[PDB]
């Protein structure tokens, strides 16, 4: 003869539920990204410039070296 | 659900999405939104299930 028991929501109400869409910005504006990539192939581009002139001189070298054996 | 309710529908808050060019996308983005607003609706329903007899 105890009282009713039942299935029930707990006093005062559960919490709130959350369903509305939730996808952040969470990014760089345009300009950044394009000053990076720019930025990136100029100092590849230098680099580059050094190196290939320092494989020229070498080729030079190389080549000297066969002028001079070939008689 | 909204214009001819049978259960308890009349006593739940809820959005029906709509669509505007009729296409596959649309229908995709109203599914979606269609699942939000039952995650809302059964909040609702949780939150106010009276007692008695089944």
Redesign the interface.
Do not use: A, C, F, N
């Given at each position: 003869a105890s009282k009713?028991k039942?299935?029930?929501?707990p006093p005062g109400?559960?919490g709130?539920?959350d369903?509305?869409?939730n996808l952040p910005r969470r990014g760089l504006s345009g300009y950044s990204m394009f000053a990076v990539g720019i930025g990136t192939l100029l100092f590849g581009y230098w680099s580059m410039m050094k190196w290939n002139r320092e494989r020229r001189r070498l080729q030079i070298e190389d080549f000297e070296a066969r002028i001079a054996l070939m008689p | 659900r909204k214009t001819q309710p049978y259960d308890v529908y009349d006593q739940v808050e809820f959005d029906v999405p709509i669509g505007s060019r009729g296409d596959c996308y649309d229908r995709y983005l109203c599914r979606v939104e269609e699942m939000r607003q039952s995650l809302r609706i059964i909040s609702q329903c949780l939150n106010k299930m009276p007692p008695g007899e089944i």
């Open positions: 009713v039942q299935d029930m929501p109400g559960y709130p539920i369903y509305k869409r | -």
